[PDB]
Amino acid sequence: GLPTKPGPGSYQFMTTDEDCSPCILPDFQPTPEIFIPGKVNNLLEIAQVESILEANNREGVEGVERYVIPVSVQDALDAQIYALRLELGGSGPLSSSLLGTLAKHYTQWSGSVEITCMFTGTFMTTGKVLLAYTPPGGDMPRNREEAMLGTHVIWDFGLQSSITLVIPWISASHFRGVSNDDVLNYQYYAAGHVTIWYQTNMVIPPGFPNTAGIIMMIAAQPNFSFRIQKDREDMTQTAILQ
């Protein structure tokens, strides 16, 4: 026999092993692969697809209505429409989206994200909106004067119903932590703020609905990636399923 020295790690089972193993049915010949539409080779093809933010997460809003941010006729200038901490982890609105639910399976992320907004008011309803991205270091911008100092787009309601604010990868490091784990101070990875402001006002003809909606949508850009698989927090069980 060939002299050998089995070493440490002998007979262990690692769940991420990449080893060949004997087939219990070595003569089996599977059914052919047929053409099926929509073959996926990499889950970042899904992450680049837009999905709707559960953006209207105010206490008391249930169901489909959590998907429409209110936008109204204002009686005061430069008012705020929306505020959102840029986070792939945690439990805020981004966490339940396609990108957010993929991020639940991963520990680290990098790359640019885009947010596409669609206005749902009547044809006759006009308005201009400021969408701002504030890099980290401080708090959420308090007024439109402070928010405009950051990356921002200005949206004119019109025939083209939707706008994109690209949130570019602006970062001290090549990767950030998905989670906000407190004991581990993963707030170190704070990724900034997204805020929405009235650039002029929502204006309506007499007797029209004085309230309309924005449907926010989010997706990853082609420069985006995830590392380190991890267990999804909110997919649990207390018993074996029967």
């Binding site: 889950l43 090549h174 420069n223 698989q229 997919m235």
Partner: protein, 278 residues
């Protein structure tokens, strides 16, 4: 030799993420990349470079940890049958639906074609479930649909002339074996909008695709057990094809053979008191 070259496949993970080209300011009425129309169903085409002034970035990040192979390519628990000492026999129905982590990972796709590596860890314990010593061989028999099931520890079905079996020791290394894609269909189905039978629309046969079900694993000790044995059955999905991505499961799973959920409070993400502050 070339014959041994047949048993080696050189395979490479070197696909990179997209880079960034430098851009400058644009003042025009020609090019409006930020104006979109979500009504078409297309995702926005606007990129970094067309929205702000960018620098150049050479791509350096890989994508391989989110390849479907890497995402599914690890072992997960799928079955935990308990062999008691009264009959020294147990079984596990073969599907990936008892334990939620693998099931929820599979819920990202409709059709999935794969092979499986199974890994079985046996553990002996007392009635109060404290670890204990017991050296014994056990037998796992694959019993496909229509093969008679063993009814006792000494049933002559355990002959295993045509059912494949694996024999291993309770206190030895874990049994491990691979399995090809066995469906009569050309892929497995994670979800099924139909009935298991013609001439029948019973709710208990809605969503039941019996081509996902390849039968049973049966378990005995080769002698009568002195202590109870717990088998932990792990599956690693490999050589994986995936089609038709889905909205992933969000509500907790409740039943093994259907998608029933509570749906009492319609929300997923947590609440706040005001949309303009955190």
């Amino acid at each position: 030799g070339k014959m041994l070259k047949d048993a080696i496949d050189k395979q490479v993970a070197g696909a990179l993420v997209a880079g960034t080209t430098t851009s400058t300011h644009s003042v025009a009425t020609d090019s409006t990349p930020a104006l979109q129309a979500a009504e078409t169903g297309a995702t926005s085409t606007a990129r970094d470079e067309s929205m702000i002034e960018t620098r150049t970035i050479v791509p350096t990040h890989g994508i391989h940890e989110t390849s479907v192979e890497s995402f599914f390519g690890r072992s997960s628990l799928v079955g935990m049958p308990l062999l008691a000492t009264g009959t020294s026999i147990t079984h596990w129905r073969i599907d990936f639906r008892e334990f939620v982590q693998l099931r929820a990972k599979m819920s990202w796709f409709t059709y999935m074609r794969f092979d499986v590596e199974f890994t079985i860890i046996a553990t002996s314990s007392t009635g109060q479930n404290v670890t204990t010593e017991q050296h014994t061989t056990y037998q796992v028999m694959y019993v496909p649909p229509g093969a008679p099931v063993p009814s006792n520890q000494d049933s002559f079905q355990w002959q295993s002339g045509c059912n494949p079996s694996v024999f291993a020791d309770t206190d030895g290394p874990p049994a491990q074996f691979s399995v090809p894609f066995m469906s009569s269909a050309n892929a497995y189905s994670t979800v099924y909008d139909g009935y298991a039978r013609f001439m029948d629309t019973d709710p208990d046969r809605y969503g039941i695709l019996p081509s996902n079900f390849l039968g049973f694993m049966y378990f005995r000790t080769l002698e009568d057990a002195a202590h109870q044995v717990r088998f932990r059955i792990y599956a690693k999905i490999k050589h994986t094809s995936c089609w038709i991505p889905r909205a992933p499961r969000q509500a907790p799973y409740k039943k093994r053979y259907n998608l029933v959920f509570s749906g009492d409070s319609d929300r997923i993400c947590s609440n706040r008191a005001s949309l303009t502050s955190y």
